[PDB]
Amino acid sequence: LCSEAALQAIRKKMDLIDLEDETIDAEVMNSLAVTMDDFRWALSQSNPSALRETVVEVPQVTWEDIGGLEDVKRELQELVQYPVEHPDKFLKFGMTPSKGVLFYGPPGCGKTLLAKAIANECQANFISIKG
Amino acid sequence: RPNRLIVDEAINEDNSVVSLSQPKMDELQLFRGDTVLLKGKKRREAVCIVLSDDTCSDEKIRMNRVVRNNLRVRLGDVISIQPCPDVKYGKRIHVLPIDDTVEGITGNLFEVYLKPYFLEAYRPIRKGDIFLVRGGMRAVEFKVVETDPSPYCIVAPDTVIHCEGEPIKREDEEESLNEVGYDDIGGCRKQLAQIKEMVELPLRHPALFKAIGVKPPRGILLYGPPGTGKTLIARAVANETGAFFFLINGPEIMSKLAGESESNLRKAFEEAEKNAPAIIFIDELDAIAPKREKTHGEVERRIVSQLLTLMDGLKQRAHVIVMAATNRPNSIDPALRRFGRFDREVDIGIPDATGRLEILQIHTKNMKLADDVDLEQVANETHGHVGADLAALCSEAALQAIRKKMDLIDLEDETIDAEVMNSLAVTMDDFRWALSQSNPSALRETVVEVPQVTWEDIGGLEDVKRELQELVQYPVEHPDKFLKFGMTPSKGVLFYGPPGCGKTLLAKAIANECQANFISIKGPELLTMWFGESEANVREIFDKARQAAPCVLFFDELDSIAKARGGNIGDGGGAADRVINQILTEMDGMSTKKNVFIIGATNRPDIIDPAILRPGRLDQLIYIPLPDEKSRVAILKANLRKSPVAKDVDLEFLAKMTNGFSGADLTEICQRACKLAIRESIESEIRRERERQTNPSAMEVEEDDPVPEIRRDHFEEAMRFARRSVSDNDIRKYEMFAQTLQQSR
Ligand SMILES: Nc1ncnc2c1ncn2[C@@H]1O[C@H](COP(=O)(O)OP(=O)(O)O)[C@@H](O)[C@H]1O
Numbered sequence: 009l010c011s012e013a014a015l016q017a018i019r020k021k022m023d024l025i026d027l028e029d030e031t032i033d034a035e036v037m038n039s040l041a042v043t044m045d046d047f048r049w050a051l052s053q054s055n056p057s058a059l060r061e062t063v064v065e066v067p068q069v070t071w072e073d074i075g076g077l078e079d080v081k082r083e084l085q086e087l088v089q090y091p092v093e094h095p096d097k098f099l100k101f102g103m104t105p106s107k108g109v110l111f112y113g114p115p116g117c118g119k120t121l122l123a124k125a126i127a128n129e130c131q132a133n134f135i136s137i138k139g
Numbered sequence: 140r141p142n143r144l145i146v147d148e149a150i151n152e153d154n155s156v157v158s159l160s161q162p163k164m165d166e167l168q169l170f171r172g173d174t175v176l177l178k179g180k181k182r183r184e185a186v187c188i189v190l191s192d193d194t195c196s197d198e199k200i201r202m203n204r205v206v207r208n209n210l211r212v213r214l215g216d217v218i219s220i221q222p223c224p225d226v227k228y229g230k231r232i233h234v235l236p237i238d239d240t241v242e243g244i245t246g247n248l249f250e251v252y253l254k255p256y257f258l259e260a261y262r263p264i265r266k267g268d269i270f271l272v273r274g275g276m277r278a279v280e281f282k283v284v285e286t287d288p289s290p291y292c293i294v295a296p297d298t299v300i301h302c303e304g305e306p307i308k309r310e311d312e313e314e315s316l317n318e319v320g321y322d323d324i325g326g327c328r329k330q331l332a333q334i335k336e337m338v339e340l341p342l343r344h345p346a347l348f349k350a351i352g353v354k355p356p357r358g359i360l361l362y363g364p365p366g367t368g369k370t371l372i373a374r375a376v377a378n379e380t381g382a383f384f385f386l387i388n389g390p391e392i393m394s395k396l397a398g399e400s401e402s403n404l405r406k407a408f409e410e411a412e413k414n415a416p417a418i419i420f421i422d423e424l425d426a427i428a429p430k431r432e433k434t435h436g437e438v439e440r441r442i443v444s445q446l447l448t449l450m451d452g453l454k455q456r457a458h459v460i461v462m463a464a465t466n467r468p469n470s471i472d473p474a475l476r477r478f479g480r481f482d483r484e485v486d487i488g489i490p491d492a493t494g495r496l497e498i499l500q501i502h503t504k505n506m507k508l509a510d511d512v513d514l515e516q517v518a519n520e521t522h523g524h525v526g527a528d529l530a531a532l533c534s535e536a537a538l539q540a541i542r543k544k545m546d547l548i549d550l551e552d553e554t555i556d557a558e559v560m561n562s563l564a565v566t567m568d569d570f571r572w573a574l575s576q577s578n579p580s581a582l583r584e585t586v587v588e589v590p591q592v593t594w595e596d597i598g599g600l601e602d603v604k605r606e607l608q609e610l611v612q613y614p615v616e617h618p619d620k621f622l623k624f625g626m627t628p629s630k631g632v633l634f635y636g637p638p639g640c641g642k643t644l645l646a647k648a649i650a651n652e653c654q655a656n657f658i659s660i661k662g663p664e665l666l667t668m669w670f671g672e673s674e675a676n677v678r679e680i681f682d683k684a685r686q687a688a689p690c691v692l693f694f695d696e697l698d699s700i701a702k703a704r705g706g707n708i709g710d711g712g713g714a715a716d717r718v719i720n721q722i723l724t725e726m727d728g729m730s731t732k733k734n735v736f737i738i739g740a741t742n743r744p745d746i747i748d749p750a751i752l753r754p755g756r757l758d759q760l761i762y763i764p765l766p767d768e769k770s771r772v773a774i775l776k777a778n779l780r781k782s783p784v785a786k787d788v789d790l791e792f793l794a795k796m797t798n799g800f801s802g803a804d805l806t807e808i809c810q811r812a813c814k815l816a817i818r819e820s821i822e823s824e825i826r827r828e829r830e831r832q833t834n835p836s837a838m839e840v841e842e843d844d845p846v847p848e849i850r851r852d853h854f855e856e857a858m859r860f861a862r863r864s865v866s867d868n869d870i871r872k873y874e875m876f877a878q879t880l881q882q883s884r
Pocket residue numbers: 073074075114115116117118119120121
C-alpha cells in the first residue's frame with residue numbers, strides 16, 4: 009500500500025515534467041510529498057487477505073459507554089477481577105472460583121456491550137463466536 | 140519549448156489526421172485543415188493534416204497506427220512539430236505493393252484500390268511513406284518509392300499515377316502494420332486501461348524505478364472464461380510497449396518425457412532473463428499447477444515446485460513481468476498466491492451488448508457489407524457469445540455469401556480476379572443463416588451488466604422512487620458529505636407487496652440510474668444450491684459481487700425456502716437454514732469501503748425469519764401498493780412504445796374501469812390485443828393470396844400490405860376475456876401486516 013501510494017504521487021508529477029529528456033536527478037521526488045488523497049486512492053483498489061479469520065483483540069468500549077446497571081457492574085467485577093488479581097487470597101481459603109455466567113433478558117439491552125466493557129477493564133482478549 | 144507534445148491513440152481512423160488541442164493550435168497560429176510537418180525519432184519525417192478535438196489536453200496529440208509507424212515512434216514518446224504550408228502540387232507518383240500481401244490477386248490494382256482512396260481527400264504524401272488500404276477481403280499496404288516534386292506533394296485530380304512493376308521487398312525497420320494492437324480489442328476498456336497503466340510503468344523507464352526504490356509488480360494473473368481474448372491482450376501489450384514476448388504452453392511442457400520438462404522451463408526463464416525487458420506468458424496455468432488433491436502422481440509435484448522456486452528466484456535484475464492465464468481462479472494451487480508471486484488479479488468478463496457490437500465492428504472492417512444490414516440488431520440478439528464465437532460467425536457469414544457466386548469464378552485461375560471481390564456483398568440473410576446453425580458457449584454463466592430500463596418505463600410510485608434515490612444515490616455520489624459527519628449508510632432494502640407489481644423493474648431502474656452493475660439471483664437457482672448442491676456457491680457469488688463494485692445485488696423470491704420448508708417433507712429445513720446462514724455470514728462480513736447494495740424481494744412478509752430483520756442487515760421496509768390513478772396509463776404507454784397505435788379507444792376510460800389490477804394483467808391485455816391484430820392481418824393476407832390465384836394481376840388500384848392499424852373492436856374483445864389475478868384477501872392481509880408493523884413495534 010505504501011509503495012503504490014508513492015507511485016501514484018510520482019504519476020501525478022510525471023507527464024508535466026520533461027521525462028522525455030535526461031533522467032530526473034531525484035530532486036523532483038524530493039519536492040514530491042504524498043497526500044491523504046493518494047492514500048485513500050491506494051486503499052480503494054486494495055485486496056485484503058485476512059477477511060474470514062477469527063480476530064483476537066482488546067475491545068475499546070469503556071464503562072461510560074453503558075448507562076446504569078450498577079448491580080450487574082458490581083457482580084461482573086466480583087466474578088472476574090477477584091481471582092486474577094487475588095489468587096493467593098483464594099488459595100488461603102482454598103476455593104476454586106466459578107468460571108461461567110449467563111445473560112438472559114429482553115433483546116437489545118447491552119449484553120454484548122457488557123461483555124466488551126468487562127473484557128476492557130481486565131485488559132484481556134475477546135474471542136466472539138456468533139449464532 | 141512549446142513545441143514538443145505526447146503521442147496517444149486517436150479516435151478517427153483516417154490516415155492523414157492528427158488531433159491537437161484548440162489552445163495549442165491557436166498559439167501555433169495554425170488554422171483548421173492546414174498542412175503540417177511532423178518530425179520524430181530516427182530523423183524520420185512525415186506530412187499530415189490537423190483538425191479540432193473535444194477533450195484532448197494541450198500536451199497530447201492524437202494519431203492512428205499508420206502515422207505512428209511512419210514516424211517510427213511508440214506510445215508515450217514525444218514529437219517535434221513544424222508548420223510548413225508551402226506544399227506544391229504533384230505531377231507523377233510511383234507506388235508499389237509489398238510482397239507478402241498480394242499473394243494471388245493479379246488484376247489491375249489502380250481501378251480497385253487507389254482510385255477510391257485518393258479521390259476528394261488531397262492526401263499529402265512524402266517520399267518513403269507507407270500507407271494501408273482496405274479492399275475486398277484483404278488489407279494491402281502500398282509504399283511510395285518516388286514523387287515529383289520531391290519530397291512533398293499533394294495528390295490532385297491531374298496526376299500521373301504509376302503503379303506498374305514487381306512488388307518490393309519488405310524492409311527490416313517497420314515491424315508490420317498488420318499484427319495485433321490496441322485497436323484490435325473491443326469491449327474491455329477498463330481492464331485494458333488497468334493493465335496498460337500497470338505495465339507501462341516498469342517496461343518503459345526501468346532506471347526511474349531503480350532510482351526511486353519501489354517494488355514493481357512481479358506477477359499478473361488474468362482469469363476468465365475461455366475464448367475471451369487473454370492471449371490477445373498480452374500480445375497487444377507486449378507488441379505495443381516494446382518487449383520480447385515469449386509464450387510458454389502448458390500442454391507443451393507437460394508433453395515432454397520426465398526430467399526434460401523442468402529443464403525446458405529453466406531455459407525459458409533464463410532466455411527471457413537475458414533478452415532485455417520481456418514478458419513471459421504461461422498459458423493454461425491450471426493444466427500444470429492444479430490443486431494438490433487433484434494430483435496423484437509425482438512428476439506434477441516436481442513441476443509445481445520447480446515453477447515456485449524459479450518464481451521466487453527473481454529479485455530485481457531486468458524487469459521481467461510474468462503473466463498467467465487460468466479458467467476459473469480457484470483450481471490454481473493456493474501456494475501460488477503469496478506476496479512476491481502472482482498477487483494482482485484482473486478479471487476479463489463476458490462482453491455486454493455494446494461489447495458485442497464493438498467486436499462485430501472490429502471483425503467486419505475488411506468486408507464490404509451492403510448498405511442494408513443493421514449491426515445493432517445482430518449485436519443485441521446474440522447474448523451469450525464470446526469474442527471467438529463472433530469472429531467465427533463473421534467468417535461463416537462471409538463464406539456463405541461467397542459460396543453463391545461460384546458461377547462467376549468457375550475455375551478462373553489459381554489467382555482470383557480483383558473486380559469479383561468488389562462485386563461481393565454480405566446481406567442480412569447471410570448473417571441470419573450463420574446465426575441459425577451456431578451454438579454459443581457461455582449459456583450457464585452469471586451475467587453482469589448495466590440494465591437498460593429507465594425511469595419512464597415505470598408508471599407512478601413517486602414516494603418509493605424518492606426513497607430509493609435518497610438511500611442509494613446520496614451515500615455514493617457525494618461521499619465527502621458522508622465521510623464528513625459520521626453517518627452509517629444502510630446496507631440493504633427489503634421489498635414486499637402484492638405479486639407482479641414491478642419489484643424487478645424498480646431494482647433494474649435504480650441500478651441503471653446509479654450506473655452500477657446488476658447481478659440477479661433468482662429463486663430456482665437459490666433452491667438449486669438449497670438441495671442437491673452445497674453452500675460453497677454463495678462464497679463466489681459474494682466474491683464476484685465484490686469484484687465488480689459498485690453493484691446492486693438482487694435476491695428474488697427470498698421466501699421460496701420457507702414456502703418449500705412448510706409441508707409434508709420435513710427433511711430439508713436444514714438446507715434452508717444453511718442458505719440463511721450463508722447469506723447472513725457473508726452479509727455481515729462486508730465493509731463500508733466498498734459500495735455493495737443488497738436488495739431482497741418477497742411476497743409473504745410474515746413468513747421470513749426474524750434474524751434478517753435486524754440492524755446491520757436488511758432493515759428498511761418499503762410497501763409498494765396496488766396500482767391506481769392514470770399511472771397505469773403510463774404503464775400502457777411503456778409496453779405500447781413499439782406497438783403502433785390505439786386510435787380512438789380512450790385508454791383513460793380503461794384506466795377508470797380497470798381499478799384493482801396489477802401490471803402483469805395490463806401487459807397480458809396488451810399482448811392479447813396484439814395477438815388478435817396478428818391473427819386478423821394473417822387471415823387477410825391469406826385471403827388476398829388465395830384470391831390472387833384466380834384473377835392474374837387484376838388490381839387496378841395498388842394496395843400494399845395492410846399497415847398495422849389496431850382498432851377498438853380487438854381491444855374490446857380482448858378486454859371481455861379478462862379477470863383480476865390478485866384477490867381482495869391478499870391486499871387486506873398486506874395492509875393488516877403493515878398496520879401491525881406500524882403499531883406493534
Ligand atoms: N447501555 C446500553 N444499554 C442497552 N443498549 C445499548 C446501550 N448502549 C448502546 N446500546 C444499543 O443497543 C443496541 C443493541 O445492543 P446489543 O448488546 O448488541 O443487543 P443484544 O445484547 O440483544 O445483542 C446496540 O446497537 C447499541 O447501540
